[PDB]
């Protein structure tokens, strides 16, 4: 039941490590999951729906980790607060590089993937802006740019920069340097006058 | 001769304002250019080659404008120096939103488009890093992050943020606010300690 669905998703995630979704057939997913092709269509309408499901799981994993941080503040300085938050995305998406890569590509062809990404980016930007606003209200950060616009640019920077690093794009920040790079830009732009 | 080639390119740029390249046929380009479909194939091997050419023109337009700034420094403060440079990309790509949008999408399917974008991003990042390094050498900027890694993240932020704004993506910075937003992040991250 749910056993076969998880097998399809595990097969898809593993095959995406080796080739794009365009190079994966429904028969590949069924064969790797130990089922027939008609049985596959009971669980998923298409291979694109499998990727949508995988991306939904990764994005909710990141969101739930951020929710955990929000409820459990780490007793540390302000730079470490931002670093621990950026690390949620570095670690979660960096642990699922193949699904991350395929998911971003699917944005151009799937309105469901595009809407899923848009929905969570809006949530993450709104939370970023709320934390910036809290830092301004306590007097720690200066009232410079509108917080929501600053939050938008910083979140888009992280999206583009993390995903370029994971994909080994030319140009990209080395994966071993990208966390420090992003933290620097966040902290200077949020606290700098 | 070159008259017909420019007509094909002008037709393509105008049709891209209304629908994606997938929805444009070679007959559409030929008809709008006043030629037959076989005559089109004399000038271009495919509609994708037309887009590649359009993107090449826009990217070189931006590069040449940046070269002009580099040779003709504006007598103004440091924040205005960075703003005038970011504006090259804001104005050049914002004046060709349809080609910009189609060109970024083609990166996923055209190795020639992907290599073209990669080549110029490497050039722009190297120049950004050289300007940061010059500011550090004269004592105006602190020696914080490696300049090339900082330059990479800032250039990727501008790519993602400008193109989201031009496309009216959800989420995005309003086009009327994006220049100020990016300038703030560049100046604070380059000069902040
Ligand atoms: O990194 C972010 N978003 C995205 N990265 C790549 C895909 S989108 C960050 S860091 C960070 C720190 C915080 F204290 C609060 C929120 C926050 C967020 Cl939201
Ligand atoms: O904006 C840039 N790059 C890209 N924007 C979107 C596509 S890529 C900027 S601003 C800027 C200022 C400078 F003084 C020197 C370089 C420079 C560059 Cl390079």
Residue numbers in the entry:
A (entry chain A), B (entry chain A): 22 to 214
How does the study describe this entry?
The mycobacterial HTH-transcriptional regulator (EthR) has been reported to be a facilitator for the resistance of the second-line tuberculosis drug, ethionamide. Studies of the resistance mechanism of ethionamide revealed that an increase in the expression of HTH-Transcriptional regulator, EthR, reduces transcription and the level of active EthA protein, and results in resistance by M. tuberculosis. The discovery of this transcriptional regulator led to the notion of controlling EthA expression levels by targeting EthR and thus boosting the bactericidal effect of ethionamide. EthR binding site is characterized by a long hydrophobic tunnel surrounded mostly by hydrophobic residues, many of which are aromatic, plus four polar amino acids and a basic residue.
We then managed to obtain X-ray crystal structures for compounds 1, 2, 3, 5, 6, 7, 10, and 12 bound to EthR. The EthR-compound 1 co-crystal structure confirms the occupancy of the compound in the EthR binding site. Compound 1 is active against both EthR (IC50 ≈12 μM) and InhA (62% inhibition at 100 μM), confirming the computational predictions. Interestingly, this compound was identified solely from structure-based predictions. Even though an attempt to obtain a co-crystal structure of the compound with InhA was unsuccessful, the docking LEI values for the compound to both enzymes (EthR: 1.58 and InhA: 1.11) indicate high binding affinity. Another common feature shared between several of the compounds (1, 2, 3, 7, and 10) is the presence of a ketone that forms a hydrogen bond with N176 in all but compound 3. Thiophenes and thioethers are present in compounds 1, 8, and 10 and are known to be substrates for EthA.
